[PDB]
Write a protein that binds this ligand. Structure first.
Ligand SMILES: Nc1ncnc2c1ncn2[C@@H]1O[C@H](COP(=O)(O)OP(=O)(O)O)[C@@H](O)[C@H]1O
Ligand code: ALF
Ligand SMILES: [Mg+2]
Lengths: 593, 453, 50, 452
């Protein structure tokens, strides 16, 4: 060895430049292997290997690191700890506990070279087994559960790579480190724990993918009606600065019919993350009594934080989103924002001296994004149970100047089927959510239309299409109003613009901070759209009978107000909305006479 | 002997360099035995002195250099061709993915293929009835033709491809089409929908398919289309079948070659894409046509999504310079519910003149066709004026045209993704759209064809 | 009044459609050309190092 | 002191045969004439180390020159005596006052605030401007910039805020850190003369960086101010305000050094890491749990071509919460300051409004004033396109209201410090023009209590 003793391979740094560090004497290491760099011991990842030299993608700041400092490898890839104690905790890009970070470092700021486990390895969880001894098990089968939260049951599964029969299993209080079960595999006996590791850059395995045909209830009326996202679908929200990309994600992270939300603060504001860990512990569900924080794991790597850690934060979240997907749960993954991950790749590409493709971003940006969104979807999870898990991807895109022709927005539109294109002009007119109904689309609207029509037992797809037909006719009419004039419009066409006006500021507009409108149930949306549609249905009946335009408008002033306030009708009083339909006919009949 | 070395030099991304080797040929299929037992295929890109630079299709993820090996196979990447391929599902490299029996190969063909002698070529004048009036009348599709479908992100390009293979046939014959499909980096939802349509039709068993999804490594997408065209010409000229080729997404294919082009530090061209893109796409598109003396034929219907919906992008531009015409789907026509949203003004077919006329379709097809486009162009030109300067400001003669283009979009083009209209019903419909304009404005139809119809 | 209205909408279209469509068009045109030559000389520096 | 200079190419310089040279380490070069120039390790490899000298490499003899490695990055000597002093881009004394004795030495890069230890913005900070104090409230710990243009009087508004900003119901715990980034000598003496005559120098720490100063001193100037700002706020418990201008000259100096080091240019020539580099400056603001005082930043930048999609204002809008727009149409009308509240926004104003942080009517009056202006301007536009006869009687009232709103409420003067009381009282007086039935966003309660 050396000087009468031997030990593991010790590297030495030969080059330190920004987030990229190269060190010699690393032949025993591999690609995608984590490693502590320097005397400080900061975390890095090997990405390129030339002879003994390795190219390290460091996820911490490298200021004050020079050659001669040693580098120690871990032998394992970029992985995350998956077990009890993961929910209701926020992590950095490398999944370290930030609350534990402050307690150990005893400082309100972020140090360097701080080693901390992801989960709490000394917390006593009472385990509850669910399988019998001697039952043949494979990856995916459940051996027990642990009620992590009041309603979330952390079902312990068989880790990937283990296949055999259960030798001995017993319930009791134990930590994530001590064994709870023994499996008699073909390669011998194995000891399993409640914690398992999984590399973040490779997606977790499944049986097969399924078509997402179950529309998700987001509570937002502009979404669930015209541009619906399915359970397991992928939705991109590209918009300029202050157009409402995050706010849309906060509402989805709180009004979605999902069993777990995964919010990734990728390169966003630090105040946007503190607002989460304060409001979410107070968003109590009135049915289960469990807070929203009990139903969500968020990962946070802000903008001023290490640039390379933005990529780690993305793959950390989707891996956790896959870990709970395999339990048959419907998990939603929030990426805020993916445009900052792309900058980290372009930043890394400029350091590696690679050939830039479109607008400086590396040429492999299309695959890296496609590799991510395909890891979502409604799946058949592993195991003999054939259970259905799903991952719904809600990623935000922050283009320069709001120009969607930028690379990351186009590559996202290719692999997703929902496009919630935010508009700056709508955010200026206090039109919220600032969803452009002309440019946005959802490829699920046809399938959602079939599903939605059935439960409602009403031609709901024909009401959405008719409501869409009025809004597209409004765009064609506004070009003539600015050219010729509104007074030059016919009684029928001017009615269309007024009916379309009711669709805009009574149905599409939704305030995020107001309690009455922040959520709209599926049954409430039907009563609202039916009343707005019944207005124009009987109004054109009157214009064809001989009534004038202004005669119907001035004679319906009282009724026209009841529709504009229908958004604030509580769910226990939905009879008020539907009664306006019959009320309109009575008011229309006297006007005709 | 078994050529395998264990002296790795460096590993950078998808590329890899081995030193102290000998006898390594260019474009040679390799295998990488790692320190854990995994095998990942690859091809040689450059051989100089005792060094060899290779590209790993599945990528280099978690590879130790000191304890790995590289097994050179001494032959280019091949495909096990056999008639037992009919109705099988292979991956983007060729391995079967439908969990069935292994194919007993009748032959092993190089995926690069071969160049058909232009003297041995037979000019395709055959007529294909696609059931779509915008194709059968305006941009006629022939057997053995290179006609791609240009589309964008979100447009119903996958609905239009299933419609064509469902309704394709030839006049005065009963022959069936041996469809060959190839998925290149698409999502699972697009592929599954295509599978369900093929099942519904009953042609699924006839089709041979290669699958590369989005979660698959991007490097292998370079070989996946060459897998299909090798199997397509295998069933056409050697087995005597009429083969139809439909591929999507070709956009992801070009992105895959740029990744290697960027990894190899080559001299870039337009927008970072390699300079030999026109040639590389030509090795795939020119594998189509008929050969004199053989009953087979290879027809290609490529599909690509135009990046930023821009025709001047290098991907759809170079495709047009190779293929015979194109079929363009616009977001504006899909915006109006037009099914299929085919924009026939910028679209073109170049093999149709020999495929139309008396004895092939209709005597007067060419005169109606020519008369249609010209009047549609002016009618669309007038509509774009009506919406700006007003309806009344338009000339009365042009105003008749403004309605000409309106009905020629909602009734003529808009027919649905499940309507198989005949060629006689398509040409009779076209005259009904020309009867609006007075006889004096139909100047590119002769009196003989004007009088008889 | 009819000729007033024809000219009126003639004027209105130019201010609200034709001229703004050009103004935004010129912006995008000039934008592209500069970054293109900016990224074109960038690779020429990299090729010079070969 | 190493004398192994290997290469001197442009602003860069390579030093071979070194031991223990760290990244981002500040160096000290002693030339053949005894003159001293400071540098910074841009990259270290093997026994080599590439550095860039701040002042340049003109007239350097690589043979007889020596380089000294200090062993620390660029630092700043912080102390309590910085209040009332003026420093340069590198923190060196400019007023020729007494020697400063630093208490500690902090890295100009600092450290990241732990998101779990971060405290949300609270209460409010008086800006003495009606368009800010009421419509776009500034909160302790908020990133709220001011978007301007070349020719617009953004220098007067910056000096106005730096002498009128304070904390209500608090005494002698408020300071203003004024940082100039690449400005002219006459524009520099503008603030120098204004700070001393108005007495605002007695409570301010000023860092001045001229246009002819080295471009590295231009990109290191805002980091000096924020390091001293975090010292007065987190170690001394003061509500510190940080005013910076111009940010455009920072972006030009950042692109100048990027082109000097031959980095891959991003959009519009600027570095692709411009969003990251700007974020390392704007994310310094915010409050900390269990820590008195706050760091508040008011960026001031000029928009090139008056275009908001430019990488300088656009990427800034992605970091900062909101923005303050200065338009040309209002500046030509004589509105001081020419603030357009239609495109402006304050995203944290909710933590500034309400009782005890502002008058109970603040939230209700703010939103009704906004809707009345938006309809009033919209009606004022209808009067030019379609004449005055196409607007109804209620339309001409809103159009008349928008005139008084821009000429009396917004137009206050660059030397007119209003209070939160006077601002809300001036706004209530303006609402009396509109009928009580038109004030549909204020509940009947606050209407009967304040409407004159
Ligand atoms: N759905 C909404 N309802 C009400 N206000 C909204 C909504 N969406 C956005 N806003 C307003 O826009 C501002 C910026 O929203 P945010 O989502 O942070 O923008 P970004 O697109 O930059 O993420 C918020 O402060 C909020 O006041
Ligand atoms: F406030 Al932003 F995208 F501009 F999150
Ligand atoms: Mg946001």
């Amino acid at each position: 060895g050396s000087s009468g003793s031997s030990g593991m391979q010790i590297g030495k740094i030969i080059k330190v430049s920004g987030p990229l560090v190269m060190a010699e004497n690393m032949s025993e290491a591999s690609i995608q292997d984590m490693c502590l760099v320097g005397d400080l011991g900061v975390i890095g990842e090997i990405i390129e290997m030339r002879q003994d030299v390795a190219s390290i993608q460091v996820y911490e700041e490298t200021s004050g690191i020079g050659p001669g400092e040693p580098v120690r490898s871990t032998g394992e890839a970029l992985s995350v700890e998956l077990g009890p104690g993961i929910i209701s905790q926020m992590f950095d890009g490398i999944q370290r506990p930030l609350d534990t970070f402050m307690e150990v470092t005893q400082s309100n700021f972020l140090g360097r070279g701080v080693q901390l486990p992801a989960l709490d390895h000394e917390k006593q969880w009472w385990f509850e087994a669910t399988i019998e001894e001697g039952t043949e098990v494979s990856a995916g089968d459940i051996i027990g559960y642990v009620d992590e939260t009041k309603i979330i049951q952390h079902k312990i599964m068989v880790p990937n790579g283990i296949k055999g029969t259960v030798q001995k299993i017993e319930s009791g209080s134990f930590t994530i480190d001590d064994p709870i079960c023994v499996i008699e595999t073909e390669q011998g006996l194995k000891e399993l724990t409640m914690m398992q590791k999984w590399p973040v850059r490779r997606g977790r395995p499944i049986k097969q993918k399924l078509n997402p045909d179950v529309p998700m209830i987001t509570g937002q009326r502009v979404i669930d009606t015209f541009f619906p996202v399915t359970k397991g679908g992928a939705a991109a929200v590209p918009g300029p600065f202050g157009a409402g990309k995050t706010v849309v994600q906060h509402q989805i992270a709180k009004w979605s019919d999902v069993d777990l939300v995964v919010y990734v603060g990728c390169g966003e504001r630090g105040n946007e993350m503190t607002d989460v860990v304060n409001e979410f512990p107070e968003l109590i569900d009135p049915n289960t009594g469990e807070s929203l924080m009990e139903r969500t794991v968020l990962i946070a790597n802000t903008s001023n934080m290490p640039v390379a850690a933005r990529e780690a934060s993305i793959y950390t979240g989707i891996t956790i989103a896959e870990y709970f997907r395999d339990m048959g749960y419907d998990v939603a993954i929030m990426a805020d924002s993916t445009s900052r991950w792309a900058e980290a790749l372009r930043e890394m590409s400029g350091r590696l001296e690679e050939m830039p493709g479109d607008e400086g971003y590396p040429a492999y940006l299309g695959s890296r994004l496609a590799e991510y969104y395909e890891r979502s979807g409604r799946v058949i999870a592993l195991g003999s149970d054939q259970r259905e898990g799903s991952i719904t991807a809600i990623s935000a895109v922050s283009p320069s100047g709001g120009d969607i022709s930028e690379p990351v927005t186009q590559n996202t539109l290719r692999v997703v089927k929902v496009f919630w294109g935010l508009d700056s002009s709508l955010a200026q007119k206090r039109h919220f959510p600032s969803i452009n109904w002309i440019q946005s689309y959802s490829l699920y609207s046809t399938e959602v239309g079939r599903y939605m029509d059935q439960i409602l037992q009403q031609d709901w797809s024909d009401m959405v299409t008719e409501g869409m037909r009025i809004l597209q006719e409004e765009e064609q009419l506004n070009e003539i109003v600015r050219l010729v004039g509104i007074d030059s419009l016919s009684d029928n066409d001017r009615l269309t613009l007024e009916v379309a006006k009711s669709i805009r500021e009574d149905y599409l507009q939704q305030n995020a901070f107001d309690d009455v409108d922040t959520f709209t149930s599926r049954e409430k949306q039907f009563n609202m759209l039916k009343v707005i549609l019944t207005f124009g249905k009987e109004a054109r009946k009157a214009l064809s009978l001989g009534a004038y335009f202004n005669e119907i408008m001035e004679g319906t002033v009282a009724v026209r107000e009841r529709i504009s306030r229908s958004k604030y009708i509580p769910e226990e009083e939905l009879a008020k909305i539907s009664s306006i339909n019959e009320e309109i006919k009575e008011t229309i009949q006297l006007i005709v006479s | 002997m078994i050529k395998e070395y264990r002296t790795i030099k460096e590993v950078v991304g998808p590329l890899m360099a081995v030193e102290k080797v000998s006898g390594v040929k260019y474009e040679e299929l390799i295998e990488v035995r790692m320190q854990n037992g995994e095998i990942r295929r690859g091809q040689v890109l450059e051989v100089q002195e005792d060094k060899a630079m290779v590209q790993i299709f599945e990528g280099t993820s978690g590879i130790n250099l000191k304890n790995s090996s590289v097994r050179f196979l001494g032959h280019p990447l091949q495909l096990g061709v056999s008639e037992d391929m009919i109705g099988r599902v292979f991956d983007g490299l060729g391995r079967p993915k439908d969990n069935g029996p292994e194919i007993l190969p009748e032959k092993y063909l190089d995926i690069n293929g071969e160049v058909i002698n232009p003297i041995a070529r037979d000019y395709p004048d055959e007529f294909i009835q696609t059931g779509i009036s915008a194709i059968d009348h305006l941009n006629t599709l022939v057997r053995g033709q290179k006609l791609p479908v240009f589309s964008g992100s979100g447009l119903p390009h996958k609905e239009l491809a299933a419609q064509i293979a469902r309704q394709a046939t030839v006049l005065d014959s009963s022959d069936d089409f041996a469809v060959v499909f190839a998925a290149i980096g698409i999502t699972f939802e697009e592929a599954e929908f295509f599978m369900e349509d093929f099942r519904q039709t009953g042609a699924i068993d006839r089709s041979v398919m290669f699958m590369n999804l989005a979660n698959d490594p991007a490097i292998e997408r370079i070989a996946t289309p060459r897998m299909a065209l090798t199997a397509a010409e295998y069933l056409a000229y050697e087995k005597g079948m009429h083969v139809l080729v439909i591929m999507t997404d070709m956009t992801n294919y070009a992105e895959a070659l740029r990744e290697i082009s960027a990894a190899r530090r080559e001299v870039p061209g337009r927008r970072g894409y390699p300079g030999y893109l026109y040639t590389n796409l030509a090795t795939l598109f020119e594998r189509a046509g008929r050969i004199r003396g053989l009953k087979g034929s290879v027809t290609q219907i490529p599909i690509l999504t135009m990046p930023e919906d821009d025709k001047t992008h290098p991907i759809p531009d170079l495709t047009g310079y190779i293929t015979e015409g194109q079929i363009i789907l616009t977001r504006e026509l899909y915006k109006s519910g037009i099914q299929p949203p085919i924009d026939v003004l910028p679209s073109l077919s170049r093999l149709k003149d020999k495929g139309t006329g008396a004895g092939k379709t209709r005597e007067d097809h060419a005169a109606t066709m020519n008369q249609l486009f010209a009047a549609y162009a002016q009618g669309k030109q007038a509509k774009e004026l009506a919406v700006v300067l007003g309806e009344s400001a338009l000339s009365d003669i042009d105003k008749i045209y403004a309605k000409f283009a309106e009905r020629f979009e909602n009734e003529y083009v808009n027919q649905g993704f499940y309507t198989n209209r005949t060629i006689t019903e398509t040409l009779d419909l076209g005259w009904e759209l020309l009867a609006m304009l007075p006889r004096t404005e139909l100047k590119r139809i002769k009196d003989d064809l004007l009088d008889k119809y | 009044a009819e000729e007033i209205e024809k000219t009126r909408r003639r004027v209105n279209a130019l201010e609200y459609m034709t001229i703004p469509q050009l103004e935004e068009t010129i912006y995008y045109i000039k934008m592209k050309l500069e970054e293109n030559e900016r990224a074109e000389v960038t690779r020429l520096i990299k090729v010079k190092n070969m």
